[PDB]
Amino acid sequence: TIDEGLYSRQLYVLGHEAMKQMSQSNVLIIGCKGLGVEIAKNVCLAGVKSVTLYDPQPTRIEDLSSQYFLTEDDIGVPRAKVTVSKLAELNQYVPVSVVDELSTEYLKNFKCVVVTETSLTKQLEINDFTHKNHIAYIAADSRGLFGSIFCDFGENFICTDTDGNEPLTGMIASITDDGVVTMLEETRHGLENGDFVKFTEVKGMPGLNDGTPRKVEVKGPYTFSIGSVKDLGSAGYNGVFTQVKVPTKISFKSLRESLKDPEYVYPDFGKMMRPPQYHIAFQALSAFADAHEGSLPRPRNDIDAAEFFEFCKKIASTLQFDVELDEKLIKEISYQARGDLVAMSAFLGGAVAQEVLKATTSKFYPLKQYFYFDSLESLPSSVTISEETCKPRGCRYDGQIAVFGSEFQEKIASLSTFLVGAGAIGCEMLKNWAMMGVATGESGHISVTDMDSIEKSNLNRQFLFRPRDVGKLKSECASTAVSIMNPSLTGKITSYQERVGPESEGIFGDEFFEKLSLVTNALDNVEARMYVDRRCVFFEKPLLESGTLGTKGNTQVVVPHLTESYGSSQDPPEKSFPICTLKNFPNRIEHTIAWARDLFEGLFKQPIDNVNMYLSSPNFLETSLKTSSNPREVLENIRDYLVTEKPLSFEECIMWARLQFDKFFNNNIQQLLFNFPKDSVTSTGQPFWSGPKRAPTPLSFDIHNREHFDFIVAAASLYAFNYGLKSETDPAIYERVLAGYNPPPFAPKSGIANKDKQELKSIADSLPPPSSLVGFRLTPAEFEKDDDSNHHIDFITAASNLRAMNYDITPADRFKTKFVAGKIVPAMCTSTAVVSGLVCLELVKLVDGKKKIEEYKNGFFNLAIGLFTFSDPIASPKMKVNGKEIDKIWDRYNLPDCTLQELIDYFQKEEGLEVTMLSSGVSLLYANFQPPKKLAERLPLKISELVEQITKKKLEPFRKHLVLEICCDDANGEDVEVPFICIKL
Template identity: 85%
Template sequence: MSSKMNIDQTGSGTIDEGLYSRQLYVLGHEAMKQMSQSDVLIIGCKGLGVEIAKNVCLAGVKSVTLYDPQPTHIEDLSSQYFLTEDDLGVARAEVSVPKLAELNQYVPVSSTPQLSIQDLKKYKCVVVTETSLSKQLEINDFTHENGIAFISADSRGLFGSVFCDFGPEFICTDVDGNEPLTGMIANITDDGTVTMLEETRHGLEDGDYVKFAEVKGVPALNNGQPHKVEVKGPYTFSIGSIDVLGGSAATGGIFTQVKMPQKLAFKSLRESLKEPDYVFPDFGKMLRPPQYHVAFQALSAFADTHNGALPRPRNDADAGEFLQLAKKIGTSFDSQLELDEKLLKEVSYQAKGDLVSMCAFLGGIVAQEVLKSTTSKFFPFKQFFYFDSLESLPTSVELSEESCKPRGTRYDGQIAVFGAEFQQRLSSLNQFLVGAGAIGCEMLKNWSMMGVATGEHGHIHVTDMDSIEKSNLNRQFLFRPRDVGKLKAESAANAVAIMNPSLTGKITSYQERVGPESEGIFGDEFFGNLSMVTNALDNVEARLYVDRRCVFFEKPLLESGTLGTKGNTQVVVPHLTESYGSSQDPPEKSFPICTLKNFPNRIEHTIAWARDLFEGLFKQPVDNVNLYLSSPNFLETTLKTSSNPREVLENIRDYLVTDKPLSFEECIIWARNQFEKFFNHNIQQLLFNFPKDSVTSNGQPFWSGPKRAPSPLTFDINNRAHFDFIVAAASIYAFNYGLKEETDPALYERVLSSFKPAEYTPKSGVKIQVNDSDEAPEAAANSDKQELKSIADSLPPPSSLAGFRLTPADFEKDDDTNHHIDFITAASNLRALNYEITTADRFKTKFVAGKIVPAMCTSTAVVSGLVCLELVKLVDGKKKLEDYKNGFFNLAIGLFTFSDPIGSPKMKFNEKEVDKIWDRFTLPNFTLQNLIDHFSEKEGLEVTMLSSGVSLLYANFQPPKKLAERLPLKISDLVEQISKKKLEPFRKHLILEVCCDDKDGEDVEVPFITVKV
């Protein structure tokens, strides 16, 4: 089955799901189709303009055209990562085109040396940066009149501005960006009252629309027509009388929320300047947008009177002139507005500043707005968005006109804001980046522009155990198609060293997972020398481990993550904030086992079942066979420790004897037998145990509510779902045995047409688990030790199969040639047909079975920008909670929330207050007796229990003889003795957990202990 959909992108008639898969799960195929037909013009190719262009190219529009005839200046290199010193004097657009074109083979990129107003008719969206207000007005007057989306954006130091105008009649097809709500229905009464099954909340609001499927009794409800909702309660809603649909009542079925298009009217820029509508990014700064509305107009007015030049850094004369312009504009705009002169002067001071962090943040936002304009998906900005990160301004260095003046270096755009002394601090950082995927690539790019670790003593360490795959290229922008198969960390390090040659020799890449197994590499000395740690990880377990290491070594941690259009950032500051591990997300939702095994009612249930079936057919049994052949004590261990030894032994017998194929034809026969077993025989047995007219002990129909009565499937070679299952199953089974896969349909038809399935007679006495609380049927089957021994005795001895091994199928969702997703799709859909559940296509099945995290390059850019704004604060050494910001955003709806981090919790013992997370007792390698005495004499605490990991070193209730043996031992010797393991040579500290009683004999909570060894 092909992985490509018939959607036109560049005239080829297809869209490359292998490349766009993660983004497709955010936008969907229809939005991607619209985007692939949209031409975009971007004016201005400094840092912000090229960041927008980069994200738009990666997303996959039809084409991108650049306009920027200005020559490259040295200060442009502060944020424009495609420019080098060799490009000085060359037009910025000309340099950027070939490098942007490398990002996506499906998106042609070009530049135009001249641009007239009439030329704008070619484009679906026009983005304007680095352009005077008068020119913006001229362009917007034309775009507004001609139905062309217009976005203007500027980055000025720690200040940013975005304006959107999508015309007077813009249709938004998805206003909230959320997955449509869905739920199971118990019944629908004649007046249209819908009651949810088993008191599950529907989550709908008045005015929402829903459609129905699988409703019994009123077939017309299943026609896909939307019905307006009136909420009656958390478990009921009304759609109005259903008499007109030919029914008086209906039962069962599923509702799905329908996103109804909404028409939005945008004002032109000329109108909006007088009557602005604001998007508020920070509710703690609600009064600032009007100030910035005046300030950015004043900057343009200043540039108009100074031949395009902006106010000089920290120059009071320029700031005074700027302030007068702002007052004049402010009076004409709003006579009641009281200007904040201190704030406005800061805008003037930083106007020439060009920070890559702000460009990343604003560039991700603007690119998402471009995608909204071309797809009509998600709610756009209405209409002005002003942002500042003044908290990032250093306070530990003197900022003056002298310290912020240009030096003729690539960092001048950053020095204009932070000063030369602070630039030196950035160059001396020793950074550890954990992960070189989407966020990691953006972080390295930002660091290279900032000059992080470029100094004599600076260094960047980056680790990632993965290699580059095609699906990474859509959002991990340091990689190109030629890099597929290479190591991520190494490739990313090489890429940013090209962007900033000063990083050559300043980056060390690793392929190790950061965990207990790599503490010999990332150990005490390594962490001790770090300035801070930045996580760019995609799993919670690794994040928690890094967090624990940062707490132990008292290192700041910058944490972030994305999910589709959403993103979050967290800053962890030693002795100030809580750690990442202080709060955790709720566990991932799982399905009851009995539901998956026997009573599915949703396609997600059948996909989960099919995913387990994949493991149960092609992975677990194969691993067991290989262990049996290679491990002498495997059978003995299995009989003692396995929860289902019978299944393990039967698998080995079947895979080595009963079902061992010698040809691909036999693999087809095996697959055909699996079809009978899972989609016919097992269903017959279930219905034998629980016929369709069964009732419960309460007299209620057994097959009711969430329980759907299934029907066996009869194999039909002409049914595509049936045939797909055979092809996928036979191919993976052949892979297990190293047999050559056959693709000739005639071979399948010949083998299958001659196959005669055995008649199946349901058996009495077969137990079927009805509830999760019931004993699993395997428990009884595994209790017959004699039968288990008989199966074990029937296995061929490993010596008779010397050198023979099977190849397990390790699930890989992104390889379209391995049949893994094909098998799961086919198996899931066949089971869905058993239970009359609406089937799912390969695309959705891959999403659910592969647990794919939807991703957008836009969100990644925004996250990286916010993280780097916090990095600056850490380098500055800010000491107050309110100086730092944890952030959350959802680009789909233009939502941004920023909050102060939560402070680290405190605890007390013997009137002494300590930090619960960051404080610890640091002790030498005492004897156990010395340690106990130390706590008694120095802290007034009685040690009642002491442990190291899972090893209990001391407890006051232990026998006196054991205590007498342990008390004279040094802690390191005691740990080695109890754990029966020598301490690794690289380990310089031991972490001990201690329980103590205070002076009053009360149990108290105290910090952990670190022992230097």
């Protein structure tokens, strides 16, 4: 009973069983500061049964540094009481409660216990109980630019899925007597040693089809081994194999036992000596707090740092830790003890919330057991960071001033950022900017653009939007929400509903871009990313890119004149199947789903568009007769949808649907089997219908069958929608109408001058005149996956399953059909939080204006396996032009609006190069091989005039520059690459 209208994207990551187990689990959260509130928000969005909060500490001003559910009117009130009311709104299926006191025996009510802002003695007391009663325990801590996570799920934790990947499946070609399984031609199984597989449809070895898993011994990318199958047979042909994923048992140690001998998870392999340092440092922090009435070391205080280092020495000696303590790093941990950054809180909250979901669902591999992280490369170096600048000012930014200082706060307050997109990452980024105080100064400003509107499925991970906001623009709602979070942003945010692309260069022009400080992408497609990257490269602005997919995510930074751009690298492209495979010989459900989508377009979209265009354009027929690749098809569509097969009631729609069923599931298969009988052979004597080709069988219409009736209903309903008729859903009318149907006879056809044009003319003049039909239009069907009442996904599912039944393929359900046909991207709130945290950790590096390339980090992570990795950005390539060092990416030529002849002469005299090709946009302005007359005509014109003439379109008034690509040859004739040209109009 999972509400798929809300958890649509999350079910594609977790699944139905996982979320069913989640909906029966209770989570207790101790601590309601930024980290705790982040964890609680992610858990509430995920969909656990309930959340309980425990934090009786009265609110303080500094707590607003990362707590976005606290306002300045809540000072002096316990944090939990003022946070519960705002947390209760995120999800209506997840109650949120508050407990004024905790007793140990009270912990047995909860499936998971999360602990933050708690001393080590209390953590030991809680864990000593939770461990022996088999309750998952997570403890998180965030001190300045340092963070720690600890997980303990019990001694006998059972993990059903360890990586979150779909089971591997493949098509076999032959299995020898010794178990050597071979894949089809140029096909990779993708298995690893120790996996288990089960076979089906294996001919010659029926014993393998029982369904018993067998060990896999990989012997190459195309073959593997399963053991000895001597008894089961001599050789097997064809068949399919599917991977079997077996449960694993993970055994955790208690906190008391794991303090002495910890097990580390390394977020970065470049610094593998640090986590042992942080292990001592955090315990020393706890001891120091215990020795000073729970007070942490003061910011940038040397006396407190010395005392903290003495505590660290004592702890290291006590635990017999044979590690040499790095004094600088430990004292850095001491200095930033009171720091409270929203970016670190978001990062650790995403990680910890994912761990909570792992504990409650027994899915994915959990952290085992200590995860120590630092982002110490984000510490500013262009400002003064001392005890005087880092002391609190009694403002909401104390938690951040304790790390960065007041001068860096002034630098942050005067940023002018530009955020593209307002989805999940956009909302997280806006929240982080509001908490950090970005653009709250006199010269600060934020601009956010997004052309989409809020939908029900977006509320699962876009926490700034509520159900009352459905149907409104994302940017306005996000700006209002963040202005509520931080009132100082009132009047500092501007929201646009414009798509960023070539058509919006009049709004986001030179003036708009010249004032920015950085651009942050929150998009979901590669075309927009490339466009924004090109614009940033031209204007030389820093860019922050980030992306997510299920539990995976990445973040990249582009810095002018330092690193390469976003488009300098290539990603794997989308997979498109051969047209022959889709048309005639499918063997996967994806092929049939693609075929069904094409059928939907061809039945309910293209003919309607042709009919409408015929009744609007006065010269449509003549243009079509020589423009389209099949004018006969257009004429037939117009005739059929206007006169021949125009329905007058719903009964005719039902009859049409029955006829289409016959056409697409019974007759084309008969024709195909007439052309290639099931006993036919190839040119080499092999059987034709073998391997990837499956012999089909015609379907006979049976009303009682569920799939046939579903197809009839969906097709009739969509046809009625096209013609605007009143559809129905009662089976009585369908069964009554389809009873009196006489199928027209069909016999496959064996086949065996200029009169065709005369026939086309006769058909064309037979159509009713456009004048006779004025104000009459047919409504086309525009594909929409998120609506479960327009019959689109129903029709596609029914057609796909019927075609699978034709070729004996395993049918899918509406869930998988919607996933495949809709191109849905799995999404999670935890991954969004993690990527936003990383992006905001890079933003402070950008604000400081760091020059070295080793100080920046591109980040990648997969939360399903607990993998984090970072790497320096790639430096932009250099080149030699005329004996000068040129940056291939960030350098350009700046020239006036001169003539083409003058441009060529300038390039000859100055760079010593001969211009061979000159192009602008998608036009060829000049080429060395053009005829002399054309050049002599085009030489004395200015570049703007030449572009206008060639493109046959005047330049817009707002256009202030032209970008030209030039290919030139040296004196010797060797081609030399040069940067682009920027002509100033």
